[PDB]
Every structure is written in C-alpha cells, then in structure tokens.
Amino acid sequence: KAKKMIPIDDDKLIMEFKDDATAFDGTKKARFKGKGWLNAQLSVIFFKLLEEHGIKTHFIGVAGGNRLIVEKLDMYPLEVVVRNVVAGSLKKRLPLPEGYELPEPIVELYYKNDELHDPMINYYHAKVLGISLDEIKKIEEIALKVNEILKDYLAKKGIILVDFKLEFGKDKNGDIVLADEISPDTCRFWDAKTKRSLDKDVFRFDKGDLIEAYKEIYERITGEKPEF
Amino acid sequence: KAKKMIPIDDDKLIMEFKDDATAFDGTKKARFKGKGWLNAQLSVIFFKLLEEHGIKTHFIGVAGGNRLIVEKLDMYPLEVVVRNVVAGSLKKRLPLPEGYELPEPIVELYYKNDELHDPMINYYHAKVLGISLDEIKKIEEIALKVNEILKDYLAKKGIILVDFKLEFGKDKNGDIVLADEISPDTCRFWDAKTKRSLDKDVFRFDKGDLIEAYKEIYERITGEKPEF
Numbered sequence: 001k002a003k004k005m006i007p008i009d010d011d012k013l014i015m016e017f018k019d020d021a022t023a024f025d026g027t028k029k030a031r032f033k034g035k036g037w038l039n040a041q042l043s044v045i046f047f048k049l050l051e052e053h054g055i056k057t058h059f060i061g062v063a064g065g066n067r068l069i070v071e072k073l074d075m076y077p078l079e080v081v082v083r084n085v086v087a088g089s090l091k092k093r094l095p096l097p098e099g100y101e102l103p104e105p106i107v108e109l110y111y112k113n114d115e116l117h118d119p120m121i122n123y124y125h126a127k128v129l130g131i132s133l134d135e136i137k138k139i140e141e142i143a144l145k146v147n148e149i150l151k152d153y154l155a156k157k158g159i160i161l162v163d164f165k166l167e168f169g170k171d172k173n174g175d176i177v178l179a180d181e182i183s184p185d186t187c188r189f190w191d192a193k194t195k196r197s198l199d200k201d202v203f204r205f206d207k208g209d210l211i212e213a214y215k216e217i218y219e220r221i222t223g224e225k226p227e228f
Numbered sequence: 229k230a231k232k233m234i235p236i237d238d239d240k241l242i243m244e245f246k247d248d249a250t251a252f253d254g255t256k257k258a259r260f261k262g263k264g265w266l267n268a269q270l271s272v273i274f275f276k277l278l279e280e281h282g283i284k285t286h287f288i289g290v291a292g293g294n295r296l297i298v299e300k301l302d303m304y305p306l307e308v309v310v311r312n313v314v315a316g317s318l319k320k321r322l323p324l325p326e327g328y329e330l331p332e333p334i335v336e337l338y339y340k341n342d343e344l345h346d347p348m349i350n351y352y353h354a355k356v357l358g359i360s361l362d363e364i365k366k367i368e369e370i371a372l373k374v375n376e377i378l379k380d381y382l383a384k385k386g387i388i389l390v391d392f393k394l395e396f397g398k399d400k401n402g403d404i405v406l407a408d409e410i411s412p413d414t415c416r417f418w419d420a421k422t423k424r425s426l427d428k429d430v431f432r433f434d435k436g437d438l439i440e441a442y443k444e445i446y447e448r449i450t451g452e453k454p455e456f
C-alpha cells in the first residue's frame with residue numbers, strides 16, 4: 001500500500017515509504033507528493049523517542065530520502081491497536097460517541113490476514129495462531145508503555161493521541177521488538193484546541209488536504225518547516 | 229425470540245421456552261411444535277448435571293410444561309462462547325476448515341447489544357462496560373469448567389460438543405451465576421460417527437427436520453422417547 005521492503009542481508013532490510021495512500025480495504029486510492037518523506041521522517045522521530053525510553057524498535061538508521069534501515073524480524077501476524085479516545089471502528093463495538101474519552105486505554109488485537117480482512121481476535125485465537133499468552137502479555141505491556149510515552153510527548157505539543165496501530169516481531173534473541181511504522185497514516189492525531197484530524201482521516205473522509213495536515217504535525221513536532 | 233420471562237418476586241422468575249425459532253439476526257423465522265418442551269427439558273438436565281459438579285446456576289425448579297423457575301440476577305450483558313471444534317463464525321476469524329479440532333478451547337466474549345449486532349469484545353472493552361478483569365477471569369474459568377463437564381458427559385453418549393453459548397449474572401451475594409439456557413438452540417452438537425448436526429444448524433441451513441434432530445439428542449441423553 002504505502003511502503004516497500006528491500007533485503008540487505010540476514011540482519012537488516014530497507015523500509016521505503018511511498019506516496020500512495022489507500023483506505024477502506026484499498027477501495028479508495030490516491031497519491032500525495034511528499035507523503036512518503038513525511039511518514040519516513042515522523043517514524044524516525046517516534047522510534048528515536050521510544051528507544052530513549054527503553055522501547056526496543058527495529059529502527060537502525062536512515063538510507064536517504066524515504067528509506068529507513070531496519071532490523072529483520074520474525075513478524076507476528078498482528079496489528080495491535082491502542083485507543084484513548086473513541087473513534088473509527090470502536091464506535092461500532094461500543095455505544096459511545098466519537099470523542100468519548102476512555103476511562104483507561106483499550107488494546108485490540110487484529111489478525112493480519114487479507115483473506116479474512118484482518119478480523120479482531122482475542123488471546124485464545126492468538127494461541128491457536130502460535131502466539132503464547134506470555135508473548136501476548138509482553139506485547140500489550142509494550143503497546144501500553146508506547147501509548148504513555150507518545151500521548152505525553154504529543155500532548156506537550158498540542159496534539160491528542162486518539163488511537164494508533166503497532167506491529168511487532170521477534171529478533172534472534174527471542175526478544176519482542178516494535179516494527180513497521182509510526183506515522184499520521186497509522187495514528188489518529190487531533191488538535192487539542194479544535195479537535196480536528198491531523199492524520200489519514202483527512203484522506204479517509206475528505207476533511208481537507210492531507211499533505212497540509214501531515215506538514216502541520218511535522219512542524220508542530222519538530223518546530224521546523226518540512227524540507228523534502 | 230425463543231423464550232419469555234415472567235416475574236414472581238425479587239428472588240425468582242419464570243423462564244418459559246416457546247416454539248419459535250429465529251436465525252441470521254432474526255431474518256429467518258419458523259415455529260416448531262414441541263421445541264419449547266425439548267429445550268426446557270434439556271436445559272434442566274444440563275443445569276442439574278452442572279450443579280452436581282459444583283457449578284452455580286440460576287435453576288431453581290420446574291413450573292410445568294415449558295416453564296422453569298429460576299433465580300433473578302443482575303445480568304452481565306455478555307454472550308460467552310466456548311469452542312472445541314471449528315464451525316460457524318470462527319471460520320471467518322481463523323483460516324481453518326469446518327470440523328478442525330482445536331488444540332485447546334477458545335473462549336469468545338460478545339457484547340449483548342442489538343443496536344451493534346452483538347459485536348465481539350475483549351477484556352478491555354468489558355472493563356469500559358463496567359466488568360472487572362477479576363469478574364471476566366471468573367466468568368471464563370466457569371465457562372471452561374462447564375465445557376469440560378458437558379463435552380465429557382456428551383462424548384460418553386456419542387455426541388461431540390462442537391461449541392456453545394453461555395450467559396451469566398450476579399446474585400445478591402455478588403457471586404457469578406450461570407443463567408439463560410443450555411439447549412440444542414444454544415450449542416452445536418454433532419454425531420460422533422457421522423459428524424451430522426443435531427442442533428439449530430438443521431434449521432439455520434435446512435439440513436433436515438429440527439424436531440427430529442432435537443428428539444434424537446433428547447433420546448440419546450435420557451434414553452427415553454420424548455413425552456411432550
């Protein structure tokens with residue numbers, strides 16, 4: 001959809017961010033010039049923040065342009081979703097309005113499977129998929145810690161971390177390592193004052209110009225205007 | 229759909245089993261003469277078996293015909309599903325065939341909510357709904373024990389307990405008590421030899437005559453032909 005993966009060797013690979021955007025199970029599609037760059041840069045900033053906080057990520061370095069060098073891992077077939085504020089699919093699962101502030105974070109597990117359109121699963125389904133209760137517990141522990149770090153950091157910049165999606169794999173030591181990306185593609189970010197979307201929802205629901213929203217996040221996070 | 233509830237006082241009520249059957253979010257409907265009687269009788273047999281095994285149920289007694297006297301409870305808004313063999317909706321959640329024998333039982337939680345069409349939930353959604361992790365753990369512990377007792381009992385009668393749904397509430401002591409019904413409406417039952425459905429799937433998928441299938445379960449469980 002929005003990224004490619006180039007092998008280097010056993011230890012590492014390239015993760016390239018493309019300008020393509022898709023939504024609604026890729027039934028909606030557009031290209032946004034500079035999106036790749038924005039999403040690459042923001043992933044790096046977030047990975048570096050998490051690393052300083054003692055979160056193990058796959059981030060190794062940058063390879064110019066929209067390319068990151070990342071650790072190769074045995075990927076878990078999961079999308080791990082952490083939610084602070086009601087939005088998106090949660091409205092179809094709990095009878096609560098968009099914008100409802102949750103009493104505590106919700107963690108949701110989704111089975112990465114295109115044939116089944118990524119259905120939500122629980123710990124028992126995960127076990128049948130070969131993922132132990134210990135592993136699931138470690139995964140959710142990390143996700144919730146990531147949540148705390150990102151939401152605090154972003155709030156001190158005028159942004160509500162509404163929800164976000166993470167992916168994980170295992171390294172050669174058997175350690176659980178945070179993978180994939182962290183960007184306005186994979187998070188919901190709302191302005192603290194106006195509650196307006198500064199993320200992929202701008203594209204999903206035609207709420208304005210996506211590049212404009214993604215630049216605004218970047219500027220608010222870095223304090224600099226996007227170079228490209 | 230298939231049952232009514234008549235108040236008696238604070239302590240108890242009547243649960244009446246009707247001949248109505250519905251499926252596919254009540255878009256399919258029929259009436260089966262004697263179904264109420266069968267489902268009433270079988271619920272009683274199962275509740276009595278579980279009670280002997282130290283499971284707390286709402287079963288108090290029989291009130292003639294298709295009526296049970298049951299303890300009044302503060303109902304949890306849950307449908308608790310235990311699965312031993314792949315069937316039904318599980319095929320849309322895990323890429324496994326109908327009839328796959330699971331390595332261990334799966335427990336699934338569904339939020340009872342007609343507006344949302346009973347969506348599956350996890351422990352975090354349950355907490356937002358006011359159900360503590362301790363309560364959810366006690367509920368699943370009971371469900372899995374119920375599974376062991378029923379599947380053993382039924383296997384010693386030539387029936388595979390494929391999956392089933394339970395409901396629970398709290399009594400005045402704050403204890404978690406098994407409620408609603410246990411019947412061929414709320415379980416999948418397969419013949420051990422032929423793998424054929426002796427349950428509501430006969431109605432769901434026009435696999436034969438429902439009353440015939442429900443009688444066969446009853447006869448195999450009791451050793452007697454249904455009196456009515």
Ligand SMILES: Nc1ccn([C@@H]2O[C@H](COP(=O)(O)O)[C@@H](O)[C@H]2O)c(=O)n1
Nearest residue numbers: 087088089090163164165185186187188
């Ligand atoms: N495949 C997916 C599914 C959800 N997500 C993200 O997870 C969060 C939850 O999305 P839903 O409300 O669609 O479940 C959103 O921030 C969304 O962008 C994602 O980045 N990739």
Ligand SMILES: Nc1ccn([C@@H]2O[C@H](COP(=O)(O)O)[C@@H](O)[C@H]2O)c(=O)n1
Nearest residue numbers: 315316317318391392393413414415416
């Ligand atoms: N509302 C519901 C949903 C499921 N069930 C039962 O739970 C089991 C799982 O059903 P699904 O495969 O439809 O999830 C089946 O035995 C079905 O009869 C029920 O008795 N009432």
